[PDB]
Subunit: 102 residues, 3 copies
């Protein structure tokens, strides 16, 4: 049972309608085939933005990310990562972004 | 080959721009790891709303749900569930929602 | 390690706000259970449209498709296919579409 990948949401520096999701700790996993990895998104007030408008998930690499809003409250997010290659994520690396269409 | 999870779409009571997806029958599945489960969405006229505007999928628990519109017609929907924990879904339970951005 | 499914984006004939994704080569794969298949989307200028507005992924069959925008540049797209049944994709067949909400 692989450990969860931890990210923290931050407002993008350039575009206020983009949330950056940063890797909290190094995560390296040399895997084989397309795997599913649970991503743990820390609750933060910035997340509320995702509950106000449509959005598009942006991948920062060779993998796909599935995001879902949560029924309860506006400060959480569910996310699963589908890796294509081997997992070599550095701390502080950007995993993904969500672009909000206002 | 696991049996499909069956849901029925209903208009949310509070927000007319939200479709609730209710579990038709009890589904319990004590699984290990992230699994993919096909969700069977019954055709219903209410689904048409998903073909008129953008939308966001809301998860009602510890799992992620992937929805796709279907090429043919406005009364269907494709959905796959990615469970994070063991599956303990009660009949009449809400699996997920789709929030439509008008 | 299954080979990637190759698609090419084209503007839909009827609706200029729809991108069609056509199968480049025949891909048949009699599989068992829900599998994940990496889809290889050729870079094309038409893709830029996905980076300008919200969109909805439309599935052309019995499978689900996960799309993600890419951090770098407006001419690429990430996509993973989750097959429900056995894979019998013909060359020139439409795999999926993306409907852009302007």
């Amino acid at each position: 049972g692989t450990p969860d990948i931890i990210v923290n949401a931050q407002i993008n520096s350039e575009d206020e309608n983009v949330l950056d999701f940063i890797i909290e700790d190094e995560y390296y996993l040399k895997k084989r085939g397309v795997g599913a990895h649970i991503i743990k998104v820390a609750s933060s007030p910035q997340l509320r933005l995702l509950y106000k408008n449509a959005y598009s998930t942006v991948s920062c690499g060779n993998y796909g990310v599935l995001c879902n809003l949560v029924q309860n409250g506006e400060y959480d997010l569910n996310a699963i990562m589908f890796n294509c290659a081997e997992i070599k994520l550095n701390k502080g690396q950007m995993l993904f972004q969500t672009k909000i269409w206002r």
